[PDB]
Amino acid sequence: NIWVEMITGSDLVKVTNDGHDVTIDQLSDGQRVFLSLVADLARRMVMLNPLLENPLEGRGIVLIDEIELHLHPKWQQEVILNLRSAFPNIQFIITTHSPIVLSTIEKRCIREFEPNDDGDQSFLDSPDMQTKGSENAQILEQVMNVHSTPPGIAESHWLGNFELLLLDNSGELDNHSQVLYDQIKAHFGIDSIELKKADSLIRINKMKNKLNKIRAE
Amino acid sequence: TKQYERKAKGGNLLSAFELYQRNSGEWFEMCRDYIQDGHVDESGIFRPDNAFYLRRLTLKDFRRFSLLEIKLEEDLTVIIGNNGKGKTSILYAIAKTLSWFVANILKEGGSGQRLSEMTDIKNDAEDRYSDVSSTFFFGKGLKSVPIRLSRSALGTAERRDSEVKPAKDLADIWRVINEVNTINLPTFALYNVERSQPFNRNIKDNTG
Amino acid sequence: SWFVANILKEGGSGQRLSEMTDIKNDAEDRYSDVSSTFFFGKGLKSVPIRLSRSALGTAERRDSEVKPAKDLADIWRVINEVNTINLPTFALYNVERSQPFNRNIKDNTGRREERFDAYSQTLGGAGRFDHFVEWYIYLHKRTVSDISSSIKELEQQVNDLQRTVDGGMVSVKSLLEQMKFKLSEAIERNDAAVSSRVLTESVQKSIVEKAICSVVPSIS
Amino acid sequence: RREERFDAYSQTLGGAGRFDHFVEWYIYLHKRTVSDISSSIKELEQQVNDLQRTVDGGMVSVKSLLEQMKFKLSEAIERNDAAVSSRVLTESVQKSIVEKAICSVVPSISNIWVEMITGSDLVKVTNDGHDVTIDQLSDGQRVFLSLVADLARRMVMLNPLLENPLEGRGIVLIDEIELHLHPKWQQEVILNLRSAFPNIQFIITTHSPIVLSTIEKRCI
Amino acid sequence: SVIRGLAAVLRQSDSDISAFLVTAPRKYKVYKIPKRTTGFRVIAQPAKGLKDIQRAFVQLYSLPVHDASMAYMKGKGIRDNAAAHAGNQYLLKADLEDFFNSITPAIFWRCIEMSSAQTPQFEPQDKLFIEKILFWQPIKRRKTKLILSVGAPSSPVISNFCMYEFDNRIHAACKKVEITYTRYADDLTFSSNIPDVLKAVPSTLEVLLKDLFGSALRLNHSKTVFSSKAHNRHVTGITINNEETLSLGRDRKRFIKHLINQYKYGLLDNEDKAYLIGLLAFASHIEPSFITRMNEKYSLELMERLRG
RNA sequence: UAGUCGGGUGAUUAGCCAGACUCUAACUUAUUGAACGUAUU
Numbered sequence A: 001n002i003w004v005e006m007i008t009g010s011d012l013v014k015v016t017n018d019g020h021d022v023t024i025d026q027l028s029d030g031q032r033v034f035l036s037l038v039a040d041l042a043r044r045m046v047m048l049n050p051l052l053e054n055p056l057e058g059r060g061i062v063l064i065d066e067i068e069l070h071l072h073p074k075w076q077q078e079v080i081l082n083l084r085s086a087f088p089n090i091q092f093i094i095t096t097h098s099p100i101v102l103s104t105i106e107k108r109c110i111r112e113f114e115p116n117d118d119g120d121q122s123f124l125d126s127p128d129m130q131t132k133g134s135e136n137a138q139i140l141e142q143v144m145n146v147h148s149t150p151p152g153i154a155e156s157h158w159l160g161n162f163e164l165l166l167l168d169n170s171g172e173l174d175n176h177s178q179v180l181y182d183q184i185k186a187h188f189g190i191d192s193i194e195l196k197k198a199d200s201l202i203r204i205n206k207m208k209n210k211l212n213k214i215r216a217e
Numbered sequence B: 001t002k003q004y005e006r007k008a009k010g011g012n013l014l015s016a017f018e019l020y021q022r023n024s025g026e027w028f029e030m031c032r033d034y035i036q037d038g039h040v041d042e043s044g045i046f047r048p049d050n051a052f053y054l055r056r057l058t059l060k061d062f063r064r065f066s067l068l069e070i071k072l073e074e075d076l077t078v079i080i081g082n083n084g085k086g087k088t089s090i091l092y093a094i095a096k097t098l099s100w101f102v103a104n105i106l107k108e109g110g111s112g113q114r115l116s117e118m119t120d121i122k123n124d125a126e127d128r129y130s131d132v133s134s135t136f137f138f139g140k141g142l143k144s145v146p147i148r149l150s151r152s153a154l155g156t157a158e159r160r161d162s163e164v165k166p167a168k169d170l171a172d173i174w175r176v177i178n179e180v181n182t183i184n185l186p187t188f189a190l191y192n193v194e195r196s197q198p199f200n201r202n203i204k205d206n207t208g
Numbered sequence C: 001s002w003f004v005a006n007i008l009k010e011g012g013s014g015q016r017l018s019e020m021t022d023i024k025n026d027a028e029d030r031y032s033d034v035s036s037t038f039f040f041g042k043g044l045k046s047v048p049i050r051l052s053r054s055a056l057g058t059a060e061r062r063d064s065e066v067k068p069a070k071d072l073a074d075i076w077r078v079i080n081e082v083n084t085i086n087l088p089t090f091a092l093y094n095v096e097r098s099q100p101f102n103r104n105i106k107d108n109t110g111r112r113e114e115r116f117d118a119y120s121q122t123l124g125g126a127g128r129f130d131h132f133v134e135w136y137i138y139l140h141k142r143t144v145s146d147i148s149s150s151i152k153e154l155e156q157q158v159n160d161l162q163r164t165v166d167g168g169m170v171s172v173k174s175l176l177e178q179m180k181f182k183l184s185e186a187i188e189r190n191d192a193a194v195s196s197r198v199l200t201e202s203v204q205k206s207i208v209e210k211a212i213c214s215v216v217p218s219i220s
Numbered sequence D: 001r002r003e004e005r006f007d008a009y010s011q012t013l014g015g016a017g018r019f020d021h022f023v024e025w026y027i028y029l030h031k032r033t034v035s036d037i038s039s040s041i042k043e044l045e046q047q048v049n050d051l052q053r054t055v056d057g058g059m060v061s062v063k064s065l066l067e068q069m070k071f072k073l074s075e076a077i078e079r080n081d082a083a084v085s086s087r088v089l090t091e092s093v094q095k096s097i098v099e100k101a102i103c104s105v106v107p108s109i110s111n112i113w114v115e116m117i118t119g120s121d122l123v124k125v126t127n128d129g130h131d132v133t134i135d136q137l138s139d140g141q142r143v144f145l146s147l148v149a150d151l152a153r154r155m156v157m158l159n160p161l162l163e164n165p166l167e168g169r170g171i172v173l174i175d176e177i178e179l180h181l182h183p184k185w186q187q188e189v190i191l192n193l194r195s196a197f198p199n200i201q202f203i204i205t206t207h208s209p210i211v212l213s214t215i216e217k218r219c220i
Numbered sequence E: 001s002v003i004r005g006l007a008a009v010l011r012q013s014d015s016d017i018s019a020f021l022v023t024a025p026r027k028y029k030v031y032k033i034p035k036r037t038t039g040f041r042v043i044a045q046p047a048k049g050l051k052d053i054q055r056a057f058v059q060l061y062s063l064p065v066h067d068a069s070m071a072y073m074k075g076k077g078i079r080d081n082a083a084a085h086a087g088n089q090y091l092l093k094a095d096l097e098d099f100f101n102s103i104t105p106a107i108f109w110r111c112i113e114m115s116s117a118q119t120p121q122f123e124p125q126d127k128l129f130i131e132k133i134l135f136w137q138p139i140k141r142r143k144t145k146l147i148l149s150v151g152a153p154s155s156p157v158i159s160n161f162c163m164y165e166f167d168n169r170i171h172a173a174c175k176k177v178e179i180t181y182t183r184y185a186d187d188l189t190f191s192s193n194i195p196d197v198l199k200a201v202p203s204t205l206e207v208l209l210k211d212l213f214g215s216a217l218r219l220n221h222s223k224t225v226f227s228s229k230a231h232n233r234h235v236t237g238i239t240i241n242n243e244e245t246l247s248l249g250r251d252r253k254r255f256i257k258h259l260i261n262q263y264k265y266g267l268l269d270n271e272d273k274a275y276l277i278g279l280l281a282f283a284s285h286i287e288p289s290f291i292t293r294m295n296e297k298y299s300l301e302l303m304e305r306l307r308g
Numbered sequence F: 001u002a003g004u005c006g007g008g009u010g011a012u013u014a015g016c017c018a019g020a021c022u023c024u025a026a027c028u029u030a031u032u033g034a035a036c037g038u039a040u041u
């Protein structure tokens, strides 16, 4: 909710934010900046489209740089849908760094720089992968060329190394593989995704080896 | 003229408007209907018969770009890349172009914005000038509205001219038709990273 | 303002009418005009100027018509550049002229001595009484000082420095060049002052003092 | 005022830094590196000696100039002594430290330097292999450069006795560390900051899971 | 020598030709022609005396012209130009900026010097007269700016000649990669059945233009357009349909039918009637099958009455 | 799906009907001059 109070003796705009009545000055920077964008745009559309039953269905072109600016991931998952629903005839031209935002948008809408461009590329193109409805981890790797784990942390490589060790020792848990397993367990914990993946690798490799022995006999 | 009459009766907006200006009823109504006609779709949303959008953008020796072409979607286009790939540059280029429509809707022969002679020409460009070329669409009666903003580097003797007359011509139609009988007008807005400002309730604008 | 701007600078712009405050609120035509006609002898009986402004979004612009004012101001400017002539004074004194006096008077940068400082803030409404005080003190200091004594002193210093460089002290050549530049500047200013055909500071002082004493009854 | 040690505390808790103060200070450092103060003292000492010889030779007109030059020499020695007395890192070393810090922490920047272009000092950077002005940097690059540059300047000024002044003590607060950063940069930013400023207590806020992937849960 | 040749052709004295040529670059009438939408084009036509000289010059001196040049060529036109591309599925169009006004005496003489095919040899004394014959001085006060004007009768020939070497090189390059190339004045058209070969052509053009003309002649990047059978294809006002045939286009055909229907009911005014007749002549040239269909639709008698 | 091509109908630049096409991807242009088509002779 949003309303004007005059009763203190000065004109104050108030809002109900997360169930609490607050002044605009009490809003977080993220909320205020986003409110400002929508308020301004709505004002202009109302003023310029007096003959439409819904003035927000007017024509125009709106440019927004870094749409995810100050937005929590939760909000990033709704922002484009809400904007397009409120302003259905505007052409939006947007920039983003957010895989979460990209997960809500069709690949045809996306224009993507080649990674090693150096400013001689002639035409921009859409990504190969469909982004709308895709997992964020996939968008990061396939579209944004960013690894799922931070490369400058040693622990980020342990599960990969563990897998390689298993494959090098014909699928058996050797002294070296056991040490690394224990390190993974100690660092990430007993119910970590990483450990479960390691456990899975052990189980599948044991079963593959059993098959191989049966075939040899 | 008979030529303009034929084109106008074929549905060309510019011809209809030219005939209106020379004979200053029928032609006025044509122009106003072109702008105002539309329908409500199955979802209950009003849709103009003649949509307005940016179709294509070309950048030549502009900032990082030696020569770049972008085809835009009618509804939503999202530009992605690492920092320093020129995403902001693209939006700046468009906003400057749109400034020419806004200036001419406000005032006959109004001046839009310009490319910077200090910053906007590519640093290692052999020709020392930059071009921002845009093509806009306004229904099947005005399929192409081409605009070019140009600028030569500081201290170059040869100066490169912008071509903005098509923007002015379209904006004139909106302005003049509106003056006679109210119409709905297009919204143009840019929200860059400067939108993150501290709020002050007290500082009030006395400029209009 | 349009005459002043163009006397000062070729292509100078005067002041424009405001779209917000200057246009009548219920004007059917949605524009405002201020039309003035000036006279300059029998050779130029009519100098028309129009300042105009239209409301936002009107179908037609209303532009100002200022060329005659600019043409006349150009005559004054160009002829003056070749050979010094007398120039017209333009001034506005509003109720703003009633304001307290800051005693704490500013150091002579040297802007107040320039002839066309006479056009500075001339149509602002308050005058610049502070500029008068600075200028008047300046005039006094120059009157008490000897004329070209600094030049004579500088001439003597450049001659002494030239003798030192001729005596084999090459280290002071940089200082000599600086002092020669200062001397040349002083002579040029003196020559420009001489070239500008301007009244002596003593005479200027006298004229102003007499004016003040004549017009202001309590001041003798 | 930018050379004064306690300028490091100017507007430290205002929220923006003072990147403009950095630029001024950095240009200043460059000018002093290209022109050492002792040669100026030696040159000034030589000029004072030459002027003293002229005064001893009977040219009393240059006595005023000698007194001025002696004053300038004394001031230069005092500044040199104060600089000496402050036991401070040389201007060359200070410049080098800051340059290294910036290039190490800011991934797109490989080099930073001051050019004299036309008649004005300009800071230039090699950004993504291309030489550009600061004003040509992207907002993300500039914002991050600003943070690191400002912090490094302050640390150099406040820690003159350390071999590496960036190993000084302090508390730094950063709101929304991921502001304007691409995911690729978010994976490096905390590691780079902690490596460059090892003894600073960082208290930071973030909305980025990519940033959190580089941090231990105890810090969250 | 040029003077003597012209004098002979025009049956005038050497002296009167020479005297006329002294101020020939200024002997142009300037006027405006309305564009089909909003605005005007500015045209500069030489005075009658100068036109005669220009025509005589072109008669006396044959300059080489490439076969890919379709404009201003005897026995060729827009039909031939369009037909060259009708069999190919992919199309590229490029346009040169300020084409005629970009051609200066310097460019002309450079082309003469460079030319491979047998160019006329001019005496140095004649060079000044030739410049005065062929080039217009737009600015009275600036004697140094001479340019070709579209409105002059010599400008077509000179422009085609100046593009001769350009056409040679690009034609040869295109032929190696199975691209069809034609030029109609400032309009360049490229077509192919091979996907993705056309993408390289614009870059090739820029390099070649720079090589031959430096910065004098440039591509209009806003007028570079790719098309295919997925989209509308036209070449110099002629539509190429998906059956690989030349067409007037559906909209023009429907307009003509409208006019014929109006004529059938005696509703066309004389001006519109004359217009209709002219358009049918053009239609007969581009799409004779359309005329056959109209004859079938409207009665041969009606159509003959109209065309008689 | 959309856009495009266009054989037919239709007091006809509309609308409707039929069939087809799809390199990331047409935006229909300019005269009195030049060339081409038609008319005139």
Ligand SMILES: Nc1ncnc2c1ncn2[C@@H]1O[C@H](COP(=O)(O)OP(=O)(O)O)[C@@H](O)[C@H]1O
Binding pocket: B062, B063, B064, B081, B082, B083, B084, B085, B086, B087, B088, B089, B090, B119, B120, B121, B122, B123, B124, D127, D128, D130, D132, D136, D137, D138, D139, D140
């Ligand atoms: N005139 C110029 N010449 C060359 N490179 C430039 C010029 N202006 C800006 N750049 C470069 O362009 C980039 C600017 O990025 P920007 O447009 O802000 O894109 P983004 O917002 O994606 O980072 C930087 O890499 C900068 O070095």
Ligand SMILES: [Mg+2]
Binding pocket: none
């Ligand atoms: Mg004709």
